[PDB]
A paper describes a structure:
The Rpd3 small ([name]) complex recognizes histone H3 trimethylation on lysine 36 ([name]) and deacetylates histones H3 and H4 at multiple sites across transcribed regions. The [name] histone deacetylase (HDAC) complex recognizes [name] at coding regions and suppresses transcription from cryptic promoters via its deacetylase activity in yeast. Here we solved the cryo-electron microscopy structures of [name] [name] in its free and [name] nucleosome-bound states. We demonstrated a unique architecture of [name], in which two copies of [name]–[name] heterodimers are asymmetrically assembled with Rpd3 and [name] to form a catalytic core complex.
Two engagement modes (‘close’ and ‘loose’) of the [name]–nucleosome complexes were acquired in global density maps of 4.0 and 4.0 Å, respectively. Focused refinement led to significantly improved local maps, with 2.8 Å for the CHD–[name] nucleosome, 3.3 Å for the [name] complex of the close state, and 3.4 Å for the [name] complex of the loose state. The overall structure of the [name] catalytic core is largely unchanged, except for poorer density of the left arm, probably owing to a lack of nucleosomal contact. Structural alignment revealed rotational displacement of the [name] catalytic core from the close to the loose states, in which the MID domain of [name]-A within the right arm leaves the linker DNA next to SHL +7 in the loose state. The nucleosomal DNA at SHL +2.5 is recognized by the HID-C region of [name] with multiple electrostatic or hydrogen bonding pairs involving residues Q937, K941, H1221, Q1222 and K1244 of [name] and backbone phosphates across the DNA minor groove. Upon engagement mode switch from the close to loose states, the [name] readout and SHL +2.5 DNA contacts act as anchoring sites to allow rotational displacement of [name], and the linker DNA contacts are temporally disrupted during the process, reflecting enzyme–substrate engagement dynamics. The existence of two engagement modes suggests dynamic association between the [name] enzyme and its nucleosomal substrate, which may be beneficial for enzymatic turnover towards different acetylation sites occurred to histones H3 and H4 tails.
Numbering used by the authors:
A (entry chain D): 96 to 130, 166 to 187, 259 to 378, 400 to 477, 489 to 523, 534 to 564
B (entry chain E): 545 to 564
C (entry chain C): 220 to 401
D (entry chain B): 17 to 384
E (entry chain A): 664 to 727, 749 to 840, 859 to 885, 890 to 962, 972 to 1032, 1134 to 1322
Write the structure that this text describes.
Amino acid sequence: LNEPSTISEDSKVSVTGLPLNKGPSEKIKRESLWNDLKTFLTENMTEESNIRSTIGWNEDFCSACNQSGSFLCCDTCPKSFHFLCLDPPIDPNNLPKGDWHCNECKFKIFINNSMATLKKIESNFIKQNNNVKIFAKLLFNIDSHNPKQFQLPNYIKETFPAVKTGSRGQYSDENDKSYNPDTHIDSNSGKFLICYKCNQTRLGSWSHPENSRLIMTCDYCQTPWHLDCVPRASFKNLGSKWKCPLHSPTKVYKKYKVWKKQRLINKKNQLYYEPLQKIGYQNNGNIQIINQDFKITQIDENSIKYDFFDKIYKSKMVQKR
Amino acid sequence: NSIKYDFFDKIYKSKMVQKR
Amino acid sequence: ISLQIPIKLKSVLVDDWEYVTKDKKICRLPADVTVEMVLNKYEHEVSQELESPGSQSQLSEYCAGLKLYFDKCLGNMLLYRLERLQYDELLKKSSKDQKPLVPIRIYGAIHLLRLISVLPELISSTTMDLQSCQLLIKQTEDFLVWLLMHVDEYFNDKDPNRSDDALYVNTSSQYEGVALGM
Amino acid sequence: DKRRVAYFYDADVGNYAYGAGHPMKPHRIRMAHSLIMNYGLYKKMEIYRAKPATKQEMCQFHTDEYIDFLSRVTPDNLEMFKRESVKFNVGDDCPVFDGLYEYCSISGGGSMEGAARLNRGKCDVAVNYAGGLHHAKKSEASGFCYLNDIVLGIIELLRYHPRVLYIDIDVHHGDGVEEAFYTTDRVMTCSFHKYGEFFPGTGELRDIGVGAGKNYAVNVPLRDGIDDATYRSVFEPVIKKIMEWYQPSAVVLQCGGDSLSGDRLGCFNLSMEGHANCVNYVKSFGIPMMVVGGGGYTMRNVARTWCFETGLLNNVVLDKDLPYNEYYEYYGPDYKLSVRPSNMFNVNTPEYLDKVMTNIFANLENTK
Amino acid sequence: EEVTFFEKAKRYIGNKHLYTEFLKILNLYSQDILDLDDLVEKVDFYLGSNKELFTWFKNFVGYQEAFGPSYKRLPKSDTFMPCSGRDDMCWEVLNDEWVGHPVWASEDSGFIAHRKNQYEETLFKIEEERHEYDFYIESNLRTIQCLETIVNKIENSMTIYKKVIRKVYDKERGFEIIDALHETAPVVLKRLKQKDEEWRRAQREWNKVWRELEQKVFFKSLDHLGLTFKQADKKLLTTKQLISEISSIKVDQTNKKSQLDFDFPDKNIFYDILCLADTFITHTTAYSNPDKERLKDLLKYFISLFFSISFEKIEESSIFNLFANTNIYIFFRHWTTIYERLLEIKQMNERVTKEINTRSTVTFAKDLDLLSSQLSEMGLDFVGEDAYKQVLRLSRRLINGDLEHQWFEESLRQAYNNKAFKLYTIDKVTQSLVKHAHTLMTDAKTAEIMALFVKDRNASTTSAKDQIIYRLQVRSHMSNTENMFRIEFDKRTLHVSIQYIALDDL
DNA sequence: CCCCTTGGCGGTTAAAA
DNA sequence: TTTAACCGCCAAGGGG
Ligand SMILES: [Zn+2]
Ligand SMILES: [Zn+2]
Ligand SMILES: [Zn+2]
Ligand SMILES: [Zn+2]
Ligand SMILES: [Zn+2]
């Protein structure tokens, strides 16, 4: 056997920058200098153990979702589509292996004789006028459009001034979000952050930093909290916005049965209303302390106190009689 | 705050009567 | 053209958007009240109360056209990106039996409700007249009022964690990965 | 105690490298082996080589599709695999290298064989540092892990024992092993981890378990830079109450080097003796144990710590001088057997730990 | 009583926006919506800070499955996944319904890692290069062993050899040569031996380089606070921070006389600080020739008067109060800081010295080949020479400027094991102490206040008017805006108490 | 040998976007 | 709109 001499392209590169066969790299020399037997007894003292009980077994975005990823591009029309963002959804494993044209290109080749197109639609219409014809135009035309991801029509969203579209199109609402002694200082009043739970700031000292405590300052009502006062391990920086235990649930499971609080609507469309009984008036949790379905009651605060008391009385009358 | 006082006095007398 | 969707249905649509896109949930299919069933119930309940003949045949024509349009446009403009993989699963499951796909018997009451939100944006790019579009808008408005009538049974609040029959089901890491990554 | 200690080591678990700058190298295991062989510990332990696992045993917990994918996936045929890569999370974070299936099979076989030896009664201490991939969950690679050999270990131990206790002291929460037994009341998991915006993301305090396994899962969240005098003080009472009240038959302990001081990814400030105190206290109960080795990405520290642990298991305290292993140059300026803590500030106040103990003990008061 | 709970809650919460939420929660309960347990929890988080009103609420109302926040639940459809080996018990104990998938528990945002200094990065790079060399060499060694066992047989564990042969024959001819071997063994064996020899030579040279690099960086890597220190001390050892601390303690105590407290157990530390201060004063070219002696006498008089230690031994080397302005308070705080740091250093000194003098060395190869001979050639390795006194001597050296900060810090780190990082600013803190003494001297009002303090202190037998007339005179010397500090000390037990009477004298 | 000379670093702020 | 010039403040060392 006479194989080719050697591998002349032997040493290419390594992690050290050098080809692993050259060594010190003198520049690094000057940068990084100043000026009971062995293991070989493992081959014999290893016994193969097999006693297991189971031993015997063009564009960079998709033309439908406007996002990057796997692309099945076209040639007749410079567009790009995801394999899933396509009607019908086609599997990347079994590629068509051929000329793939979008629906618009298919129509423009097969149908679009610039004048005769009317005839075509006409024909469809006259085979659908006797049958359902209100939808005839849409039924004919939606065979000429490309598939799209479904987004709300830009006016359902605006009915609520507490929602917004994220980067790619996601949902986003009002909850999306060594020794530091300055965190206990407001910087606008010169006062400390008196925590609700403990009524102290616990600044500690620079000489004794092991007596200070981390503080939170909730992101909704701006009240300060210790990380230890409400059991919690760390700050909230990346995820949602922290909310202290001094807020209403806005979601209740009573044994099941669910209750939810309504959403925020633009003040022009908000129908505020006030009752007249002032003692017993069954409202939802949509109240305000001082299309006609989202009426928020103005609850007349002194009523709430009353709304409490007899209920407890009733809760007593259940178990006392 | 007097209506609450009178109503609760009456209701407590009624409850005592019902629990004599 | 102006369309007056009631506030409860707008809230339901916003909730659907939030559930699908934020919480990664998808619909539980086949729904126990599908598009075909709700449309048939609407037609049967309204026709027995209206006596005029023309307004009774036009209602049936509108319902049939709505069914056909839903079928023809669901796989085009009614699904988010996350829900297209479940659509593919359904399509291939049907494709094993040489059967066709009938979304009106699978989807229900929440993809039809989201179907009538782009009608202003669908009619606009057409060549229809004016007094015909007005009739379509009026019919959609009566249908929306009827849907708002029976809203305490088509959209009930049940959690996927606590109920298996709830309107939405949680997804897995693999399904979400293939959907939003492939 | 004077336990009969087995020890599993395959001479090929060190020849399987991840990517270039990838922080996970199993070379450390082989390094640890030298620290165990030059210290003369081979005269006190029965070294074995577990037979590599097969697909029919991995599929006990994992799925057929995932295992079939692992056994065929290769850097060479990677561009023909485009669906299973994104589906199974076998992309960049958990890279595909040349010896993936062999490494996973060795890791699984070691744990299963140690569990079997515990079952029959040959040894009452099993040590397999190759296994301990406590992250993979039945369908997906997650955090450098591909096969949850630990869960195979508890399955094999369950085939004999009524109850098993799985203690995890890796800095990352044991999501994979807590998920597989979230519902059952046989296996009780107890994980000490760092909770914040850290990699596992799970392990909240109120994760007591769902369904039939309610109150049978304990999570201890800890902050940055905990040290020996604090980690011991939080470790001992909880394990004391668990073993007094839950009363396991066997016990698995995950000894990860990620909690060591100066680790590439961790944020704790445990010394070698602080880590070894946990193993001392676990062995102080007498029940059979299967110690494994999970994370740890500074080899000069994890090798020393694992050697000290295996020495302590054999009831000996090793010399603080190195016996001139093959990999001498790795072991720092003084060439001792010790991990030195840093002066980083401990953010774990006693009040937070006291509240954590109150919650955990209140949860456990109903587990006779 | 029960008809006044709402007023009590209104005065307790003390806020209107939070009282709105409290009323909303009460209404939520009142409409049958909220249960009794969550109401109790919310009133525990609102009024639970009190042990009296909350208990009244509890007994008046007659109070007397739970999922976690990190696990979803899949439908039964995603239960049927084929496991070709799952036994009945495996189906019994395992779980396929609830899944966590951290990305869901991370709110799809991401994870925050830990911060690592550049020295740790250098160590990581060195470790990576070491690993690459060792991994390639060991793979080649194992394949060489297998090839030797093959060739000695033919003279008359599935991917290692293929991978290593591919690496050696990287010209893409390896695929053919592997199968040619399967059907040429000696030549590839000898080529592997040659490659191993060159790799080991390169590894020896790189071991030299890595040892040299690591010996100067390892100890720096373990210094987390020490590297940021001497920069944070600059902006954290001012007067405003000390006033902020004392005012915060006062504020915390005002919701329930001795706000601060210090204890001075040791004595010779005063002499150590005096020696450092006199050394700095002698060296510094920033004052006048008599000013140096004036500062020395001021420090000696203040020490020997406040603590009454000795008026003469300082040159051989009934509770008293003290009212002060900001200058005297900051001077005293600087003194307390220096004393605290030196006391912390001296407390562990016996164990530190015992550890240093017993530092044995390894003799297998350490003393044979490679040693760290950088801190020993300059005598900065604490060989004998009790550590506290050596630290004081090196502090005097660095104050005198004949020792760059690098080697002082390195010696301190290697001697005290990063437990003495707070001595990196001994020179600057002594300079600040001297400057504060000078400013205390060159201020007329401050001089008068110290004159009054001297009179009161040396009196040692005062009248019932002691506090009041003294305070009135000092306040007359003071303005109507600056704060007031009552610093007291009792000779019985060496305990100094600080009270923050900012404007309470009026 | 001793001084530029380098090397970094922090609060202000004005200048390019 | 913010972020890098820009002047003060410090300390190591290359070389003329
Ligand atoms: Zn797409
Ligand atoms: Zn096209
Ligand atoms: Zn607090
Ligand atoms: Zn709040
Ligand atoms: Zn880990």
